């Protein structure tokens, strides 16, 4: 059994922060670019290493997701990659457990995307599958984002959240979700 | 003799009740009772900077993540929230010790600090590499952006590694409450 360790961005250091990069870029089925990796900073990295060698990492967030009217507080994952020789392990599961703690204990939901693939993962877990459009408030105001309709998650923790409702998460360069 | 006191970081998630409870009861009183919900929620998300005497919380300070825009580019901020010591500890330079250990999560994490300053601790800031941010402040609010004229000339920055023209607009993202 693994067990992730959640390591604030600040905490990691040079040679860990340089294997995590380049891990999550070698893993990610995703076009993981150099804006995706500042997504995943700020945060907590739940990790999981091999005999020195970063073999699994989630990142969780802090952002705002506004959901009629309210802006709220949202522990917003990034980056979820295992190595390709320890895939079928079950650490992505030990990374989401850790991940799901620090929301618990820190945020008002979690909240992500899915690749269509993993979609059955997140939802065995309990995340619910979000049905209402997405937007984000762009600096000219909400902007609809259709593309990523369908590929997103949350977490409520202890709200309740009417899931065909409009979620406009909060403005970034690159993927917004 | 010099006595030193120094601050542990730990992450909103890993406080318990009793900690987060003996938290805001102290802050509340730094602030004189001026700590509303929305303030203690603004605390909330990050690593707080704790310290403690006889098992009590003396000291505090919150450093969470938020977008600050600037030239057009969503900067990746940690934002002060809560920074308060007990009114029989100071002069203890305990605010210094908090200023510490907020300083290298921002180090260590962001690509600026930012925050917003009484009139007080202008001095103290200043002091420590922070730089008061001259330009208009606004918020990205959700029709759009708002000047925020009140919060000018309150906003501190401490760049990491980014040159900051302090001249320029800084607009916050939204939340409720004081956005700054």
């Given at each position: 059994?693994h067990?992730?360790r959640?390591?604030h961005?600040?905490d990691?250091?040079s040679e860990?922060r340089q294997?995590?990069?380049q891990?999550?870029?070698?893993?990610?089925?995703?076009?993981?670019?150099?804006?995706?990796?500042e997504?995943?900073?700020?945060?907590?990295?739940?990790?999981i290493?091999?005999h020195?060698?970063?073999?699994a990492?989630?990142?969780v967030?802090?952002?705002?997701?506004?959901?009629?009217?309210?802006?709220?507080?949202?522990?917003?994952?990034?980056?979820?990659?295992?190595?390709?020789?320890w895939?079928?392990?079950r650490?992505?599961?030990?990374?989401?457990?850790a991940?799901?703690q620090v929301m618990?204990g820190?945020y008002?939901?979690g909240?992500?995307?899915?690749?269509?693939?993993?979609?059955?993962?997140?939802?065995s877990?309990?995340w619910?599958?979000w049905?209402?459009?997405?937007?984000?408030?762009?600096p000219?105001?909400?902007?609809r984002?259709?593309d990523?309709?369908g590929?997103?998650?949350?977490?409520p923790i202890?709200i309740s959240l009417?899931?065909?409702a409009?979620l406009?998460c909060?403005?970034?360069?690159?993927?917004?979700?």
């Amino acid at each position: 059994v693994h067990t992730a360790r959640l390591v604030h961005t600040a905490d990691l250091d040079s040679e860990t922060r340089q294997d995590i990069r380049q891990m999550v870029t070698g893993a990610f089925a995703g076009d993981f670019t150099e804006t995706d990796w500042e997504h995943t900073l700020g945060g907590m990295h739940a990790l999981i290493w091999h005999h020195g060698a970063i073999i699994a990492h989630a990142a969780v967030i802090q952002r705002r997701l506004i959901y009629r009217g309210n802006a709220l507080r949202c522990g917003y994952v990034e980056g979820v990659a295992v190595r390709a020789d320890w895939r079928g392990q079950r650490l992505v599961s030990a990374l989401l457990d850790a991940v799901e703690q620090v929301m618990r204990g820190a945020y008002q939901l979690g909240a992500l995307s899915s690749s269509a693939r993993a979609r059955r993962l997140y939802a065995s877990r309990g995340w619910l599958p979000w049905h209402g459009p997405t937007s984000v408030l762009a600096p000219t105001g909400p902007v609809r984002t259709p593309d990523d309709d369908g590929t997103v998650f949350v977490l409520p923790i202890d709200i309740s959240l009417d899931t065909s409702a409009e979620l406009m998460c909060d403005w970034r360069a690159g993927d917004v979700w």
